[PDB]
């Protein structure tokens, strides 16, 4: 209890942390949980602490402003420390201060809306290998596991749009291509390696020293010469890579190469389980609310008739398709928090928060606030309507974050998501099987994964 | 060999480290001599590793002010790290960064030269005690051990002008106040335990984490109840303690009352062991040249005739006093180096530092350069003289560092250490012995200590 006496001090309320643990004994229910019982006991600002890291929530949509946007660069600049990375440490979502800031600017022309424009109809191509797939699983009759299809279709979008390479990840499953890159997980903060290091934050430098990394150190040797060989066989002869390989061809210094295998790395960890878990959320809330599910796909015939091909303004037209999107991700927002370190000795919307205290942002447990959310655990696309999206505070509902750190892929993940449920949507219905779980259990673990994998039927239209 | 690599590709010169230790293994000759063979062997810049820890040393004048002055509060503001300290951290001499500047500030007005004057008679008190005592030492008529008869009276200064505590350290060597300043002695870099944190830096979070600390729990624990009694015995009824407790009634916040224990215990630690180890290196200077010792003495003898009290202004006054304790510390600067650690990627004099990169300045190495001091391993009291005192570079010559962080006691010590000389001289004359250490072998460790104690004759006048 070396710092266990911070929050009593400020007169911050907050359950008891035993010593040396602290509150990590109530992650038994998982985050989601914890940090709804806790906006509960305590209202609108408390405190706990990871280990003897302490931790300060806030739910005051004034207040969030300044932590993502205000106080951004000034005070609440990193994200909560985390390791051993190893070299890593280059990332984007990883590096700090002005590391982060050199980063953020020789990235961010990659993800503009003119270069997603251009990936448009690479993308769109394995939304039809996506189809013959599923169709062979149409005509077997039976339950379709979906993030197997749709891990496929992730699988496959990300290989071409970050390096070129064009493979049918589900008809190829012993690809070498393919077999790094399954071998690259979602990190769980609540198993046991990631708890050790919350309650032993002092182990994180032996580890670095033993070369140990949380990124497995094959599929990262595999990455780090696959680019220096495709840099080196593209060169010389409109993917993530090539934009990168662009951008050292001129803040203020050009990508390294180490430097450019670290991105990559970071998009397709991002780009892969995210995408193919929201979309299983997605299909889970179509098949168990039918009206919805037609509802879409008239709306989909409208835009594009005879099973016409999406293109980059014929889905940013459909707007039922983005309200379906919008309220999936209410609520299974990946992320389940946001969270910054604090940097300074600050005074934010009149309340003192002192160095070293991370800042937390309970994103899962304000999706589901009914102060701002009308019947929350309940699936209604029509709080995103035009006429309602008004009453939506933008720092409530936060699936992507906020402030100059956000997610910089946001509106690629929501392009490569839309074509997916687009060309899906256009030659199949999904009715919900006997071992359908209904209602979905979320994970008791750290990801926001369902207990047991969704599975549905398929029929061809 | 983590980052061994890194001078090799800047091109910068240096002898070749092993893996995991470095360059540790040249240390067993100790820091001054390294360094002086080292600005042999490479130039006016070179590199070596402390560890996985990169050291830059420069030895250009000009890049030492970029450093030290122009580029302090830029990017070199804080010194190497090193633990585990404890709630030592709030000590100014070990805070870093904003935290630094903070206390900086609250301590500055307390060594104005305003506040020194005031100390003066209280100071010159204990002269008389030191006196004394060494006349029953002169009349023991056998060889009298410095660092006894001068660490008795530093301890008597220190207690006095700290705290206001006023005993005679030497006739009672057994008082409470007395013991504990005694058991706090100067940290050898090159000792076992702290070469081990050089080559183990990540066993630093280890100890932290199990409360040791490289101050001794006791000595820091009596002290931080004796200034919470004295806040609380002097209240209500010219001391270090008085000007802090009169801070804390007004950048920008007050003093706090740990902060006030971390200043004391660094005020302790800075007068005690210095300035009796700069009195003995006097001593020994003047009784190895006789010439010196009578000079001194007459000149003393005419701003103080029949033996007359030393005032501050008196003190000032003399400035072959002041020749003679300034060649004195060329020879023999307690501090060796000055260090500053790079907190960004800057360019400097021509010259890329990349961050983390602890830049280092051989002070010892540059006192006994011939390319700027003539005969330098002679003690020539002259090159200080008001004719030549011009040819001295301000950035070669550094015993009190330089810059907004140098030693905020220079001027303390300088009027401590020279009114013992004055009252020494005024009845005494210092012969050598036959055990006296002729020339003086300085100590092979990581302190600027002799290898024997000095001994030597005192006759009375
Ligand atoms: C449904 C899909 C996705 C969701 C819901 C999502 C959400 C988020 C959230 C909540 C954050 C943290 C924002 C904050 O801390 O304030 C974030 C950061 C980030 N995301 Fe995403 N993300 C998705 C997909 C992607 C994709 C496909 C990429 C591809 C590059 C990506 C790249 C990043 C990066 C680089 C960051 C860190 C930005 C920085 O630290 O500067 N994300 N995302
Ligand atoms: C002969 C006596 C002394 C010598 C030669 C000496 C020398 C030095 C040197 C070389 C430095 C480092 C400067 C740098 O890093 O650039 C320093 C720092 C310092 N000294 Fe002294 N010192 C002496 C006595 C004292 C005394 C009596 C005090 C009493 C308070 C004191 C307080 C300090 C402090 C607080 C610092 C750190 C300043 C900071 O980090 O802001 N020193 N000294
Ligand atoms: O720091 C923390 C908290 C540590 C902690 C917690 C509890 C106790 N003790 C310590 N967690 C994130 C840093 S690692 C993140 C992990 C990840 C998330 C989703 C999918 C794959 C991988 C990652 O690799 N992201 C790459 C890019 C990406 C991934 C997913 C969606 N968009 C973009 C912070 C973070 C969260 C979300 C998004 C980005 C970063
Ligand atoms: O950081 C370092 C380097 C660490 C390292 C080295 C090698 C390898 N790996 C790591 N060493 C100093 C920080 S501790 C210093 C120790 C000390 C010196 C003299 C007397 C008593 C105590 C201290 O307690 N000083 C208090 C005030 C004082 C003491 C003496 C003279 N004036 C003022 C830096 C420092 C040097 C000199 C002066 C101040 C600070």
Same mark, same amino acid.
């Given at each position: ?6 929050? /009593?001090? @400020?007169?911050?309320?907050? %359950? ?10 109530? &992650? ?27 931790? *300060? ?45 050199? $980063?953020?600017?020789? *990235? ?7 270069? $997603? !424009? ?23 009759? =039976? ?9 496929? &279709? ?28 399954? /071998?690259? *997980? ?21 580890? #670095? ?8 150190? #094959? ?5 780090? !010469?696959?680019? /220096? ?5 593209? $060169? ?18 050009? *990508?390294?190469?180490?430097? @450019? ?10 780009? &892969? ?28 015939? +409208?835009? $594009?008739?005879? !099973? ?7 889905? @940013? ?9 919008? #309220? ?26 002192? =160095? ?7 994103? &899962? ?28 505070? %933008? ?17 690629? +993940? ?25 209602? @979905? ?10 207990? =047991? ?9």
């Amino acid at each position: 209890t070396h710092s266990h006496g911070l929050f /009593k001090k @400020l007169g911050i309320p907050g %359950p008891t942390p035993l010593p040396f643990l602290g509150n990590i004994l109530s &992650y038994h229910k998982g985050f989601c949980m914890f940090d709804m019982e806790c906006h509960k006991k305590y209202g609108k600002v408390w405190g706990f602490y990871d280990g003897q890291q302490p931790v *300060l929530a806030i739910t005051d949509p004034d207040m969030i402003k300044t932590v993502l946007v205000k106080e951004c660069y000034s005070v609440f600049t990193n994200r909560r420390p985390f390791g051993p990375v190893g070299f890593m440490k280059s990332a984007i979502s990883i590096a700090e201060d002005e590391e982060w800031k050199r $980063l953020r600017s020789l *990235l961010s022309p990659t993800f503009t809306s003119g270069k $997603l !424009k251009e990936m448009v109809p690479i993308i769109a191509q394995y939304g039809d290998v996506l189809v013959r797939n599923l169709r062979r699983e149409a005509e077997t009759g =039976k339950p379709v596991t979906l993030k197997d299809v749709f891990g496929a &279709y992730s699988m496959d979008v990300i290989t071409s749009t970050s390096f070129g390479v064009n493979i049918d990840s589900l008809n190829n499953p012993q690809d070498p291509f393919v077999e790094n890159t399954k /071998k690259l *997980l979602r990190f769980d903060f609540l198993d046991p390696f990631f708890l050790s290091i919350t309650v032993f934050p002092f182990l994180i430098p032996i580890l #670095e020293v033993l070369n140990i990394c949380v990124f497995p150190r #094959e599929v990262t040797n595999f990455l780090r !010469k696959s680019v /220096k060989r495709m840099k080196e066989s593209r $060169l010389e002869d409109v993917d993530f890579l090539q934009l990168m390989i662009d951008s050292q061809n001129s803040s203020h210094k050009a *990508l390294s190469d180490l430097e @450019l295998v670290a991105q990559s790395i970071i998009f397709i960890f991002a780009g &892969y389980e995210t995408t193919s878990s929201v979309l299983s959320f997605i299909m889970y809330e179509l098949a168990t609310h039918p009206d919805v599910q037609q509802k879409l796909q008239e709306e989909i015939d +409208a835009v $594009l008739p005879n !099973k016409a091909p999406p293109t980059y303004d014929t889905v @940013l037209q459909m707007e039922y398709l983005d309200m379906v999107v919008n #309220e999936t991700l209410r609520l299974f927002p990946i992320a389940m928090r946001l969270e910054r370190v604090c940097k300074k000795d600050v005074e934010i919307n009149g309340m003192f928060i002192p =160095k070293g205290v991370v800042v937390m942002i309970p994103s &899962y447990a304000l999706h589901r606030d009914p102060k701002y959310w009308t019947e929350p655990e309940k699936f209604l696309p029509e709080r995103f309507s035009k006429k309602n999206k008004d009453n939506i505070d %933008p720092y409530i509902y936060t699936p992507f974050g906020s402030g100059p750190r956000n997610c910089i892929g946001m509106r690629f +993940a929501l392009m490569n998501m839309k074509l997916a449920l687009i060309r899906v949507l256009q030659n199949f219905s999904f009715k919900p099987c006997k071992e359908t779980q209904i209602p @979905l259990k979320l994970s008791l673990g750290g990801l926001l994964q369902p207990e =047991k994998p969704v599975v549905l039927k398929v029929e061809s239209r």
